[PDB]
Design a protein around this motif. Structure first.
Motif, mmCIF file in Angstrom:
data_model
loop_
_atom_site.group_PDB
_atom_site.id
_atom_site.type_symbol
_atom_site.label_atom_id
_atom_site.label_comp_id
_atom_site.label_asym_id
_atom_site.label_seq_id
_atom_site.Cartn_x
_atom_site.Cartn_y
_atom_site.Cartn_z
ATOM 1 N N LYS A 263 0.787 -1.161 -0.179
ATOM 2 C CA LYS A 263 -0.017 0.023 -0.129
ATOM 3 C C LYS A 263 0.948 1.488 -0.014
ATOM 4 O O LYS A 263 1.975 1.045 1.142
ATOM 5 C CB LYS A 263 -1.124 0.085 1.032
ATOM 6 N N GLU A 264 0.129 2.260 -1.260
ATOM 7 C CA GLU A 264 1.138 3.033 -1.244
ATOM 8 C C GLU A 264 2.810 3.427 -1.836
ATOM 9 O O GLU A 264 3.223 4.477 -1.589
ATOM 10 C CB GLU A 264 1.182 4.240 -0.153
ATOM 11 N N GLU A 265 2.740 2.562 -2.173
ATOM 12 C CA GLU A 265 4.571 1.788 -2.299
ATOM 13 C C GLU A 265 4.548 2.116 -3.660
ATOM 14 O O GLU A 265 4.201 2.175 -4.463
ATOM 15 C CB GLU A 265 5.638 0.683 -1.899
ATOM 16 N N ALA A 266 5.796 2.970 -4.443
ATOM 17 C CA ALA A 266 6.129 3.943 -5.333
ATOM 18 C C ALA A 266 6.933 2.913 -6.495
ATOM 19 O O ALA A 266 7.126 1.745 -5.527
ATOM 20 C CB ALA A 266 7.030 4.506 -5.525
ATOM 21 N N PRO A 267 5.996 2.433 -7.386
ATOM 22 C CA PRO A 267 6.782 1.733 -8.473
ATOM 23 C C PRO A 267 8.554 1.217 -7.855
ATOM 24 O O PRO A 267 8.930 -0.023 -7.825
ATOM 25 C CB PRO A 267 6.568 1.318 -9.867
ATOM 26 N N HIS A 268 9.126 1.958 -8.015
ATOM 27 C CA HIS A 268 10.485 2.180 -8.704
ATOM 28 C C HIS A 268 10.670 1.606 -7.591
ATOM 29 O O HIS A 268 12.499 1.033 -6.372
ATOM 30 C CB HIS A 268 11.972 2.921 -8.651
ATOM 31 N N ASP A 269 10.117 2.008 -5.770
ATOM 32 C CA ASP A 269 10.650 1.736 -4.631
ATOM 33 C C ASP A 269 10.470 -0.515 -4.129
ATOM 34 O O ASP A 269 11.478 -0.528 -3.695
ATOM 35 C CB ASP A 269 9.693 2.502 -3.619
ATOM 36 N N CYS A 270 9.339 -0.654 -5.274
ATOM 37 C CA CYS A 270 9.104 -1.421 -4.856
ATOM 38 C C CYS A 270 9.825 -2.687 -5.796
ATOM 39 O O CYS A 270 10.174 -3.341 -5.003
ATOM 40 C CB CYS A 270 7.755 -1.797 -5.106
ATOM 41 N N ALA A 271 10.406 -2.215 -6.500
ATOM 42 C CA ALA A 271 11.052 -2.656 -8.061
ATOM 43 C C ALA A 271 12.684 -3.092 -7.318
ATOM 44 O O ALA A 271 12.870 -4.274 -6.429
ATOM 45 C CB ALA A 271 11.982 -2.451 -8.415
ATOM 46 N N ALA A 272 13.571 -1.760 -6.365
ATOM 47 C CA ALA A 272 14.328 -2.337 -5.958
ATOM 48 C C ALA A 272 13.947 -2.962 -4.158
ATOM 49 O O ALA A 272 15.172 -4.113 -3.958
ATOM 50 C CB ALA A 272 14.715 -0.752 -4.991
ATOM 51 N N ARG A 273 12.852 -2.658 -3.849
ATOM 52 C CA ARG A 273 13.260 -3.971 -2.354
ATOM 53 C C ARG A 273 12.767 -5.187 -2.825
ATOM 54 O O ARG A 273 13.367 -6.296 -1.961
ATOM 55 C CB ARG A 273 11.826 -3.352 -1.599
ATOM 56 N N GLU A 274 11.576 -5.457 -3.808
ATOM 57 C CA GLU A 274 11.736 -7.191 -4.050
ATOM 58 C C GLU A 274 13.114 -7.428 -4.368
ATOM 59 O O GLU A 274 14.116 -9.003 -4.010
ATOM 60 C CB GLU A 274 11.054 -7.471 -4.697
ATOM 61 N N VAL A 275 14.234 -6.707 -4.830
ATOM 62 C CA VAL A 275 15.209 -7.421 -6.297
ATOM 63 C C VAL A 275 16.259 -7.219 -4.436
ATOM 64 O O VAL A 275 17.169 -7.621 -4.385
ATOM 65 C CB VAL A 275 16.125 -6.117 -7.085
ATOM 66 N N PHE A 276 16.371 -6.526 -3.232
ATOM 67 C CA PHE A 276 17.399 -6.325 -2.583
ATOM 68 C C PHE A 276 16.703 -7.562 -1.677
ATOM 69 O O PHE A 276 17.315 -7.968 -0.836
ATOM 70 C CB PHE A 276 17.156 -5.263 -1.604
ATOM 71 N N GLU A 277 15.464 -8.028 -1.489
ATOM 72 C CA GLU A 277 15.324 -8.790 -0.818
ATOM 73 C C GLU A 277 15.540 -10.747 -1.208
ATOM 74 O O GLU A 277 16.186 -11.612 -0.862
ATOM 75 C CB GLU A 277 13.267 -9.056 -0.982
#
Length: 149
Positions: A38-52
């Motif tokens: 919720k409320e997470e920007a596309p670029h932030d989600c991509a970086a988060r998932e990739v780093f996870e």
């Protein structure tokens, strides 16, 4: 569906891509990606998932307009394209409870469709361990030809 975001990471030669292998329903190989919060920007989600999933941080390398997006069964998956990451980068997921392994694969060797069973006069497609990656492969190759010659 909730949109998913992630990355197609390529090496310095543009010949290889980084895939990850999950467990169970996600037991084959696919690009690192996951569902937006919720409320997470596309670029932030991509970086988060990739780093996870890989322990590699793409945030300084994301280019806002460089991605492949596909809608698959009414859910959108967008993968940011991240070239030039050295093949000797050490990648390590957050938890081995989610990611079995992480490997570079040759783009020219990856399939861009699954095979039929027309030898067996049977409908449908043969299993393929790249099933989750396959939809992005032809668009990637076309994108690389257009945006690097």
């Amino acid at each position: 569906g909730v949109p998913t975001y992630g990355a197609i990471i390529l090496d310095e030669t543009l010949e290889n891509v980084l895939l990850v292998q999950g467990y169970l329903a996600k037991s084959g190989w696919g690009f690192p990606k996951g569902k937006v919060n919720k409320e997470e920007a596309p670029h932030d989600c991509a970086a988060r998932e990739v780093f996870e999933e890989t322990g590699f941080d793409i945030k300084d390398y994301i280019c806002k307009d460089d991605y492949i997006e596909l809608r698959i069964n009414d859910q959108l998956a967008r993968l940011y394209i991240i070239p030039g990451i050295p093949k000797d980068t050490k990648f390590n997921p957050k938890t081995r409870r989610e990611i079995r392994n992480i490997e570079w694969f040759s783009i020219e060797k990856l399939p861009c469709h699954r095979n039929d069973m027309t030898p067996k006069s049977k409908l449908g497609l043969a299993p393929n361990k790249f099933f989750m990656a396959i939809p992005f492969i032809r668009p990637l190759r076309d994108w690389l030809s257009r945006r690097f010659g």
